[PDB]
Amino acid sequence: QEMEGPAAVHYQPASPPRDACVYSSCYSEENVWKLCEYIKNHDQYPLEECYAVFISNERKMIPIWKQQARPGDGPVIWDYHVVLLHVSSGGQSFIYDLDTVLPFPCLFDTYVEDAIKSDDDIHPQFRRKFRVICADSYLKNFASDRSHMKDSSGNWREPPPPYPCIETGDSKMNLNDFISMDPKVGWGAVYTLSEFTHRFGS
Hints:
By secondary structure, the chain is α+β, with helices and mostly antiparallel strands. Helices cover 21% and strands 18% of the residues.
């Protein structure tokens, strides 16, 4: 036997269940934005406890396991993927990934163990980096005109979300500044996988 060294065993989700959330496949940056907006307006949790987390790397090829786009034990290779992180007040973190087959939400350590896995034996050009943006900053600064989702003829590669493009007073398109893992670009903090787990893991 081993006991753990606050637990949040009665943690109340910051969002509705998965199937009740606004969602479009291949627009996880917007799916997470919409979760942030829900949390802002629901007055249950301080928005500052929440973060948008972009996952990508220099070559824009990151494996993520336990993804609904590929059922089974293999990974999806994304150019980037976005999830929501809630650091609950007691210290336990939860990941909200509308594309995972893991629970929604999922304990942070379980998400890292099963969906991310170790980079130790991964070919180095697939290794994962994480850009962590305060949810308040994400709502204030993110903008996407969806121009990255069109084919060479200007038609949609994947059907867009059924509402107007997210824009701010300052920008109509800065998605590349969130996908980038250059800490001199954009908002938030950039972590390697081990830095990310060191910072938020139990």
